[PDB]
Amino acid sequence: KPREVLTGGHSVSAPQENRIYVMDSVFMHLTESRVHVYDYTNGKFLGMVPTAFNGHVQVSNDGKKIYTMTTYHERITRGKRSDVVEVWDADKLTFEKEISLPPKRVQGLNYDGLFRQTTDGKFIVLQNASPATSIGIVDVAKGDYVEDVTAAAGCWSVIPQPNRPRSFMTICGDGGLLTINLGEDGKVASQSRSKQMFSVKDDPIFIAPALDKDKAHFVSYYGNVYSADFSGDEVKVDGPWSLLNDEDKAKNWVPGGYNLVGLHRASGRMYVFMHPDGKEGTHKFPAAEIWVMDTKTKQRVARIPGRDALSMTIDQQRNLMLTLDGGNVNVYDISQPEPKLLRTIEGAAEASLQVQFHPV
Amino acid sequence: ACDVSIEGNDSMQFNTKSIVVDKTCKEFTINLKHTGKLPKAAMGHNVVVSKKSDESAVATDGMKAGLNNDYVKAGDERVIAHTSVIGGGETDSVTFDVSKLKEGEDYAFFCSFPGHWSIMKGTIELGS
Amino acid sequence: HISLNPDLANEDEVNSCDYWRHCAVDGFLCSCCGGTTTTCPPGSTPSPISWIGTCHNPHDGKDYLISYHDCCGKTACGRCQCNTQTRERPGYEFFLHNDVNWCMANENSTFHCTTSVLVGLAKN
Ligand SMILES: [Cu+2]
Numbered sequence: 001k002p003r004e005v006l007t008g009g010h011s012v013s014a015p016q017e018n019r020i021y022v023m024d025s026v027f028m029h030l031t032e033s034r035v036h037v038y039d040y041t042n043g044k045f046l047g048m049v050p051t052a053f054n055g056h057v058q059v060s061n062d063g064k065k066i067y068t069m070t071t072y073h074e075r076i077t078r079g080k081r082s083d084v085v086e087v088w089d090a091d092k093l094t095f096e097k098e099i100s101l102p103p104k105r106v107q108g109l110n111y112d113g114l115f116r117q118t119t120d121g122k123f124i125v126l127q128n129a130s131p132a133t134s135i136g137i138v139d140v141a142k143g144d145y146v147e148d149v150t151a152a153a154g155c156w157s158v159i160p161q162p163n164r165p166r167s168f169m170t171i172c173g174d175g176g177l178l179t180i181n182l183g184e185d186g187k188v189a190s191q192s193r194s195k196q197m198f199s200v201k202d203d204p205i206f207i208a209p210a211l212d213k214d215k216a217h218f219v220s221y222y223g224n225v226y227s228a229d230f231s232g233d234e235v236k237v238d239g240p241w242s243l244l245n246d247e248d249k250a251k252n253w254v255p256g257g258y259n260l261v262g263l264h265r266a267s268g269r270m271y272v273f274m275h276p277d278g279k280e281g282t283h284k285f286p287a288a289e290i291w292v293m294d295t296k297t298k299q300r301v302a303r304i305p306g307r308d309a310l311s312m313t314i315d316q317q318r319n320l321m322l323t324l325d326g327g328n329v330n331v332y333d334i335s336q337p338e339p340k341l342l343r344t345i346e347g348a349a350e351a352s353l354q355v356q357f358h359p360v
Numbered sequence: 361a362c363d364v365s366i367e368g369n370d371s372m373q374f375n376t377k378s379i380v381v382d383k384t385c386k387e388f389t390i391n392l393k394h395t396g397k398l399p400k401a402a403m404g405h406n407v408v409v410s411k412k413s414d415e416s417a418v419a420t421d422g423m424k425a426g427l428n429n430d431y432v433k434a435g436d437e438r439v440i441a442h443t444s445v446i447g448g449g450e451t452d453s454v455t456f457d458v459s460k461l462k463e464g465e466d467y468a469f470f471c472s473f474p475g476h477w478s479i480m481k482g483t484i485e486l487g488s
Numbered sequence: 489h490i491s492l493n494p495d496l497a498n499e500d501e502v503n504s505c506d507y508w509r510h511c512a513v514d515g516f517l518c519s520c521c522g523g524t525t526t527t528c529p530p531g532s533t534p535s536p537i538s539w540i541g542t543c544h545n546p547h548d549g550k551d552y553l554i555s556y557h558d559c560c561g562k563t564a565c566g567r568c569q570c571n572t573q574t575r576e577r578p579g580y581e582f583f584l585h586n587d588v589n590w591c592m593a594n595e596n597s598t599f600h601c602t603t604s605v606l607v608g609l610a611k612n
Contacts, residue, residue, distance in 0.1 A: 028566050031598060053598060054589065071597060077561055078596050104402075107597060108588035129592055130402035131537050131582060132474060154423035154474040156579030173474070173580045174420050193424070200581060207578050258587075281511070281574040370536035370593075372583070396536065402593060403537065475583040479540060479553070479607060 011091040012046050014039040016063055019046060019358035020322060022329060023057050023110050024349035030054050031076055035068065036349055037093070040322070040331055040357070043345035047093050054107050056114055059090065060140075061121035063359040066090050069105055069115050069126060085124060085138055090358070099143050104130040110354035112259055113157030113207055120165040123186050125158045135170065137186045146186035152178055157207040161230050163214045169228065169235070171207055171218075175200050177228050177235055197237035198226050206255065206283075210263035210270045210295075217263065217295065219243065219255045219272055221283050225298075241298050243272065243291065254278030256285040258353045259311035262321060264334055268295045271314070271321060271334075273306055286310060286325060292337055302338040315357040324348070324355045362388055366469075368405035370396030370448060372476055378483040379469060381458055389455040390469075392443050400447025405471050406430055407443045407454065409484055412466045414438040415477060422472035431472040445473060461486045491547030492606065494525040505570035507604075509554050512541030513570045514586045515602030518559055520568035525604045528559035532600040535560055537593055539586045542575040542610045551610035560591035562600040570602075 012019065022036040031053045037046040051057065055070035066088040073079045085099040106114050106127040114127045123146070124138040133156060137147035155172035166182035175196040183189035198205050203220045210217040214231035226239030244253055255261070257273040264271070273287030287306025294301045307330055309323035319335040329348040333340040348355075362385035367375040381388050392407050394400075404427070410418045421433040430445040441456030461467060461484075469484045470477040494502045494509070501507055503520050510517065522529035538557040545552055577584045591597045 028564055031563055073596060073598070077563065077598055081597065104592070106588065107592050111587070129582070129588060131593060132402050133579070133582065150426070153426060154580075156582065156585075171578070171580045173423055200577075204577055204581075207580070281572060281576070283576070284571070284573050372537065398536065398593060475581065478583055479555075481611070 009092070012037065012093060014041075014044065014046050016090065016358045017360050020329070021057060021059065021356045021358070022324070022348045022352050023051075023055070023354040024352045025054060025110060026349075027351040033070075035066070038329070038345055038348060040320075040329075040345070043343060049088055049093055056106075056110055058115055058117060059356065059359055061117065061119075061359055064090055065096075066093070067115075067117070067124055069101075071105065071107065085126070087140075087143075097143055099138055099145065101126075101136065101138075101145055102128070102148065104128045104134075105136065109258060110352070111157060111207060112354065113159055113209070116158045116160050116168070118166040118168065118182065119160055119162055123166060123182060125160070125168055127156065127158060135180070137182065139186045147182070147188065149180055149188055151188065151191055152180065159209050159211065159216055159228075161214075162211065163231065169216070169230065171205070173200060177237065179230070179235055192234050194228065194235040194237050197228065198224075198239065203240065206260060208259050208261050210261045212263055212265050217261075217270060219261055221254060223248070223254045223274075243274075243293060243300070245300075251276045252278050254282065256283055257287055257310045258284065259313065260287070262312045262314040264314055264319065264321075265316055266319075269293065269301070269334065269337070270295050271312060273309060273312070275306070284310075287323070290323065290339060292339065304339050311353045311355065313355050313357065315360075317360055320357070322355050322357070324352060326351055326353065329355055363391070364389070365391045365393060366407065367393045367395050368471070368480070369394070370398040370403050372403070372479055374471075374480050374482060376482055378485065380485055380487060381461070383486060383488050385458050387455055387457045389453055390441070390443065391451060391453045392446070393451045394446050394448050396448040398448045400445055400450070401427060402447070404445045404447040404473055405476065405480070406432070406445035406473060407469055408432060408472050409440040409442065409456070409467055409469050410438050412468050412483075415468050415470055415481070419470060419472045419477040423474045431474070440467065442472075458486070489548050491545060494519065494604075503568055505568070505572060508545050508547070509543050509552065509604045509606065510570055511543035511572050511574035512539070512554065512576050512586060513556060513572055513602050513604065515558065515570065515599065516565040517568035517570060518565070518601040518603050521559075521565035521601045523559065523601070523603075526606075528603070529562075529565070529601065531562060532559035533561040533594055533596070534603070535591045535594050538590050538605075539588070540583055540607070542612065551612065553607045553610045555605045555607045556586070556590065557603045557605055558590040559600045559603060560594045560598060561596050563598055565601045
C-alpha cells in the first residue's frame with residue numbers, strides 16, 4: 001500500500017532546441033569523465049552521459065542520437081583496452097550500441113576537430129594517434145569502423161566541409177590542408193593537397209576553425225588570419241591579414257584559448273578570444289576579451305570582456321554564442337555586432353573545454 | 361673502419377649523435393637496429409642522410425610520402441642515402457658511395473618518420 | 489653545473505610550476521607524487537614516447553631541450569598541477585604538442601603524472 005512509486009525510463013524534460021552539451025573531462029579523475037546536459041534558456045541541469053576515460057562527444061546531425069568516444073580497460077588501470085564509439089539516444093539518454101575501434105583513438109583535450117561527422121551524417125570522422133596520426137572512419141548505419149585514412153599521417157584535426165555530403169580537411173605539418181573525399185562505402189574516394197597556407201615555424205595557426213559554408217578561417221599565435229576556400233574542386237588558401245591595428249600591437253594582443261574561435265555565418269562575423277601582453281607560451285591563456293571581426297571588411301566591429309573564457313561555440317539559427325572558462329557556461333546574444341550577455345550557468349562542469357548546442 | 365651500427369628505441373632516440381666516415385672508404389654501410397618493442401606503423405625508425413640545411417625540407421616532403429615509401433619522397437635528390445623504415449625488433453641497411461659527400465659542407469642523419477627529426481638527429485662527417 | 493640536477497635542488501622550487509625545466513608541462517609534477525622529476529612514483533609506468541619542450545635555463549643563460557615523459561598505470565595524481573606552454577605547438581607538430589595524453593602507447597594508458605627529463609642542449 002505505498003502511496004508513491006519510483007519510476008524510470010523518462011525522457012529529457014526540456015525540448016532539444018533548448019539543450020546544450022558540456023563535455024566534462026574531470027581531469028582530476030579523468031577515468032570518470034561525463035557529458036553534462038543543460039537547458040541554456042534557464043541553466044537547468046537536464047541529465048548526463050558517463051564517458052569513462054577522457055571521453056569526447058558530439059550530437060548526430062538529425063538530432064536523435066548522442067555519439068561518444070572513450071577508452072575502457074577490463075580493470076581500468078590494467079587489462080585489455082577497448083577504444084569505442086558509443087551511440088546513445090538523445091531523449092532517453094541511454095546506451096544503445098558499441099562500435100569497436102582500433103586501440104589508438106586520440107586521447108587528449110576536447111577540441112571539436114577530433115570527433116566530428118560527415119555533413120550527410122553517414123560517417124563519424126575521428127582522429128587517431130599511436131603516436132603516428134591517422135583519421136578514422138565509422139559507418140553509422142553499419143555500426144563499424146570502415147576506413148583508416150592513413151594519408152592524413154603527419155596531419156591533425158578534422159574540419160568537415162559543409163558544402164559536401166562526405167568530405168573533410170585536415171591541417172598538416174607542411175602548412176597545407178589535406179582534403180579527403182569519402183565514397184559511399186566510407187573509403188577514400190579521392191584526395192587533394194592545397195598549397196602552403198601558413199608557416200609552421202614562423203606563424204603557426206590554431207587548429208580551431210571559423211567554419212563558413214564553403215570556407216574556413218583560422219587565426220595564428222600572432223593574431224593573423226588565414227583562410228581555406230573549398231567552394232572550388234580544390235582548396236585555395238590565403239592569408240595572413242592581421243586582427244591587430246597599431247595600438248593592438250603596441251599592447252601585444254594575441255589570440256588565446258582552445259576552441260577559441262567561432263563564425264556567425266549570416267553576418268560573416270568572426271569571434272576570437274584575445275589577451276594583451278602575449279608572447280611565447282600565452283596561446284592558451286584565458287580570454288581577457290572577445291573580439292568581433294567582420295570578415296568582409298577585415299576590421300574589428302566589437303570587443304567585450306572575455307570572462308576568462310577558453311572555448312566557445314555558435315548556434316546559427318538563434319544567433320547565440322556560448323563561452324566556457326572550464327567550469328562556467330556564458331550565454332551571449334550576437335544578433336547585434338556587440339555581444340549581449342544573457343546568463344551564466346555556474347558550475348556546468350569541473351574541467352570542460354567544449355560545449356555544443358543540440359542541432360536544430 | 362667502414363661500418364656503423366646505429367640504434368633506435370620506442371623512446372625516439374639514436375644512440376649516436378654523430379658518425380664519422382674514414383676517407384679511404386669507397387662505399388659506406390649504415391646498419392640501423394630498432395631496440396624498441398613498438399610496431400613500425402606507430403613508432404618506427406629509418407635513417408636519412410642529407411645536407412644539413414636540407415633536413416627540415418626533406419623530412420617534410422617524406423612525411424607526405426608515407427610509410428610505404430619509407431617516409432622519403434621518391435627520387436628525392438637532396439637525399440644521399442636512406443634506409444627502409446622499421447619498427448621494434450627489426451633492422452635494415454643502406455650503402456652509398458662516399459665520393460657522394462662533398463667539399464666543405466656538413467651533412468646530417470635523421471629520421472623522416474613524422475616528427476622524429478626534431479630530436480633524432482646528428483652529424484655524419486667525412487675525415488681523418 | 490648545479491642548476492642541472494633537480495635531485496639536489498630544494499624540492500620546494502623543483503615542485504614549482506615555475507621551475508625552468510617544466511616550461512611546457514601540462515599535468516602533475518611527479519616529484520610531488522612519490523617520484524622525482526626523472527622517475528615514476530612507485531607502481532607507475534614510464535611512457536616510451538613524450539612531448540618535447542625548449543626551456544631556457546635562467547641560471548646558466550642556456551636553452552635546453554626537455555622531454556616530457558608521462559608515468560602511467562595509475563589514475564590522476566592530482567597534485568602540483570601545471571599548465572605552461574613555452575614553445576608548445578598544435579598537433580601538426582605532434583611531438584611539441586601537449587594537449588594529448590603521452591601515455592597513449594603504453595600497456596595501460598590512464599595518466600598519472602608528468603616528468604621533466606633533460607635531453608640536452610637545445611640545438612638552436
Ligand atoms: Cu624515428
